[PDB]
Amino acid sequence: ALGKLQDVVNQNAQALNTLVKQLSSNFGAISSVLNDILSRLDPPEAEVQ
Amino acid sequence: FVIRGDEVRQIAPGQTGNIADYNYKLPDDFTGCVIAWNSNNLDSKVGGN
């Protein structure tokens, strides 16, 4: 019966999870971590990714 | 200034090397023109210039 509320919660929570998971995607970059790119490439090269 | 032929590539935005790092560095957002011309007849001596 309470689904209408529970559902809502899940939706919001789901979105946040998705958002956070989007921090672990390459999007075409060499890596998904900014620190790794900065440490492994010079700024002129790193900025591209 | 005066450089050697192999270092001509170093005079450009987003370049690394001895000349770029320690002698003359151009900004990444550099706006202008680089003109390099051989000066062998002017800056070369038999005993070494």
Q: Which residues contact A46 (CB under 8 A, 6 or more apart)?
A: A37, A38
Q: Which residues contact A22 (CB under 8 A, 6 or more apart)?
A: none
What is the DSSP annotation of A1-49? -THHHHHHHHHHHHHHHHHHHGGG--TTSS-S-HHHHHHHS-HHHHTT-
B29 touches chain A (CB under 8 A): no
Q: Which residues contact B23 (CB under 8 A, 6 or more apart)?
A: B1
Measured in angstroms, the resolution is: 3.3
Strands in chain B per DSSP E: none
Q: CB burial class (10 A; 0-12, 13-18, 19+) of residue B18?
A: exposed
By CA distance, what is B27's nearest residue in A? Answer: A44
Provide the 10 A C-beta neighbour count for residue B17. Answer: 14
A28 touches chain B (CB under 8 A): no
Experimental method: cryo-EM
B27 touches chain A (CB under 8 A): no
Q: Which residues contact A40 (CB under 8 A, 6 or more apart)?
A: A30, A31
Structure tokens at B3: 């450089």
